[PDB]
Amino acid sequence: QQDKFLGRWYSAGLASNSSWFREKKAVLYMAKTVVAPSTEGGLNLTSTFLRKNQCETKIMVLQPAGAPGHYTYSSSGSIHSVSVVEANYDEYALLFSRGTKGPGQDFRMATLYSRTQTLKDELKEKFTTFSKAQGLTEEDIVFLPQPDKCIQE
């Protein structure tokens, strides 16, 4: 079913306990991510985002991690283990990412992708719920605002 998730998505929700997130959450906007196959059978994620009043593009490679819906990703320099918690290929994908710079330097991140730029409240609740079930507070949860540019808004 991986092929079902190819195509255009929008990062609409983000939650984490990291230092990065805590000190950059205020400047984060919704990004447009196009998904296609990766060399090793994983996924190539090409994202277009607003960094500092500028449209940037980055390519992330989710390497297969031994099972459908499980990937590894090189970030921080650290590596992350990404899993698809729940998803409907025509509507959304709830991803969970866990990393650890070392014993006690463990960070967690919940990401909500959407086929549309608009998010239904029921979907917002699911994200908040999953995020809290992971030890994340509301101050750690944010629904990414739609950028004016860099997306074909």
DSSP 40: T
* Domain edges within the chain: 1-153
Q: Which helix (H) or strand (E) holds 98?
A: strand 92-100
3-state SS, residue 69: coil
Asked if residue 124 lies in contact with residue 143, where contact means CB atoms within 8 angstroms, the answer is yes
Asked if residue 21 lies in contact with residue 123, where contact means CB atoms within 8 angstroms, the answer is no
Place of tokens 């079902």: 4
CA–CA gap between residue 19 and residue 27 (Å, rounded): 14
Superfamily of 1-153 according to CATH: Calycin beta-barrel core domain (2.40.128.20)
Resolution of this PDB entry, in A? Answer: 2.1
| Beta-carbon contacts of residue 62 (< 8 Å; ≥ 6 apart) | 38, 42, 43, 44, 45, 71, 72, 73, 82
Experimental method: X-ray
